[PDB]
Amino acid sequence: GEQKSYLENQLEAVAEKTDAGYTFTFQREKIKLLDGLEANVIKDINPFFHKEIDVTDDEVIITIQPPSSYKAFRFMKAKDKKSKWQFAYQLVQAVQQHNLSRLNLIVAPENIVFDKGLTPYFLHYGVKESIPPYERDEERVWQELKAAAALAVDGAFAFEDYLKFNETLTFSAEAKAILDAESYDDLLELIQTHIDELEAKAKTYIHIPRKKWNIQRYIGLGLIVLLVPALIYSMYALFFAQPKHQAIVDSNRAFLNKQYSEVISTLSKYDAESLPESVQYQLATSYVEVENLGSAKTKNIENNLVTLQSDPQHFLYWIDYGRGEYKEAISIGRKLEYNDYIYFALAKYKQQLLSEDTNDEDIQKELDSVNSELEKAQKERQEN
Amino acid sequence: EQKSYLENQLEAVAEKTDAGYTFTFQREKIKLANVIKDINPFFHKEIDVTDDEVIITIQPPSSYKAFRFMKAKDKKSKWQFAYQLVQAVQQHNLSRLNLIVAPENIVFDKGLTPYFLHYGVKESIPPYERDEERVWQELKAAAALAVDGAFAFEDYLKFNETLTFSAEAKAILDAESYDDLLELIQTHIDELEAKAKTYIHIPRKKWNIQRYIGLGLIVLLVPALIYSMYALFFAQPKHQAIVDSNRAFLNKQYSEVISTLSKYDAESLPESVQYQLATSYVEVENLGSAKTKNIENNLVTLQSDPQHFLYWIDYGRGEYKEAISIGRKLEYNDYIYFALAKYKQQLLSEDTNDEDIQKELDSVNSELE
């Protein structure tokens, strides 16, 4: 199924690409050479293109060899949109600027080659009443031009789709604009606005080598993963660690001045286990002092139970008792096996539970646990 | 009043009015120009012959821009324009029309194709005759001006070994033929396309926003890192030292208080910590039981002048000249005499050539008697 191209069907010629150049072979019957020149006029358009004409008793072979750097139309499809619209602007201009009277155009893709400057060139030209296209056909050339421009810019369909079946196929917005042009200046203005819009868009863009762009991105992301711990630590050091140091300085100053109530208020927002053992000692002796027990009872606690060399559990007991945390202090008293710590905290816990209503079944169960231990220790301490 | 290159070569005044590009010559230098209308028929061309002037007016289509508008385009467009400029000169075949490849004579369309405004006429309008060598040098200078743009047209055209040209400008100006020059431009176009493949394209607004975000992160990270370094390596070890010396003070371990706060200056420590450090220096001094009792409950107390703490820390650290000044400030004669005596002992056991020590020893002995 050797299906022929548009150029081949229109001229009734075989178009091929050999090492010698582009071949356009016609039948002698369809070529009228009435002068002596043998279609010598075709060499007057692109003198830089090597042009040969072979006339035999039954065939006419035209050979066009453009410079090696010139590429066939098919190589436009892979270029960028800016280049496509520049090629289409220059393709319309080359058709519009054609003035050679004896030479007739055929705007087909198989007939176009372009240079490094994206300028299009036609390989085969018809000769007036000699080589097809025999006569000028402005309407045929106009429709060929809009289909070639649409094929080069859109590229969604083949040249014959844009050219012949135009009122049947759902074309692109860019291709419909090209194919619906009513004049050369209208199409040139349509193409110019697309070039102008692309050039304007490109001006608002920066072009960075991917390696440089990527290293700047990892630098920026590295700054973020370094700023989140530095900010979080700074917040802790400024709003938690620094005011704790000043509180430890202030509570240690108030302790030396026997201002036991001031030590309590200065360290009131801190948990006993967060404070150092020496600070725990000072807070516990301050709670013991503020408790206002007997002179002899206080003397027993301060030099036998809550000393700088005693179990830090003794400090935790008096801080819990001093902060109204009796259920917590009772557990500490049970751990140290000190029955006086258990009984003295159980008595205060009973009053704390008694302040709560007698309609909370959890409070009544806890109050029944306390009352049983207080009546057990009273009969034991009074006998032995 | 030096004119432009085009003006000096043709002996004409070149201007741009609303009617088009003006090229006015003197009647005497114009020899009897309808051939001028055969190159760009799309350009409106008029010739006015006055009794002493010939004014040529070329009006290309509105969309065509002057040579000066290439400078703001991208390098790829500048190379493509140069390619088509070399081709326009190479393809010029009209025998009676002569070229002048000057920037003030070139315009270009949306497809970057260059066009010449004024053409000379054979033995009629300058350039009167063809000059292939002048045209070749004009072309390479115009191509170099359009592509490089670092210097003016006359600098590239000068063709002298005086100006240190760019590598691209030198390549264009050193071309030996039209094909050598076209191929030279082609490899530069091909090398630009290959370089473009390794590039990412970010909208300038997006790239600028993240640059200020990134710079804002740096101005926020330097104070956060510096504060974190201070809090971790200076503020935290000082808090632990204050905790440790306050624990040792409560345990009557006066020598331990001294060694815990030894790396800190007395004025950097809080007043309560200064008190504990001073009473520790007083205790370590090992004075009399009664003498120590007088100091601890009359001079170095939690409610006394912090200068008393500074005196005992200076005395305890061998800073006798500093302690003497503090004793003089508090007007306490016992603080002056007791520090002057230890300063005399420090000066003793050094050398028998210290006249400054003998003068200081004579000052202390007179006040004690």
Author numbering:
A (entry chain A): 3 to 386
B (entry chain B): 4 to 35, 41 to 377
Could you give the paper's own sentences about this structure?
Taken together, these results provide a comprehensive picture of the network of T7SSb subunit interactions and identify YukC as their interaction hub.
We therefore produced a YukC413 construct lacking these residues, which promptly crystallized. The YukC structure can be subdivided into four main regions from the N to the C terminus: the pseudokinase domain (residues 3 to 206), the β-swap domain (residues 207 to 211), the transmembrane (TM) domain (residues 220 to 243), and the extracellular domain (residues 244 to 384). The YukC structure reveals two unexpected features: a β-swap domain and a twisting stalk. The β-swap is located below the membrane plane, where the monomers cross as antiparallel β-strands. The symmetry of the structure is broken at the level of the pseudokinase domains, which are oriented differently in the two monomers. This asymmetry is related to the different orientations of helix α8 in the two PK domains, favoring the H-bond between residues K205 of chain A and A80 of chain B (red asterisk). As a consequence, the PK domain of one monomer (chain B) is closer to the membrane plane than the other.
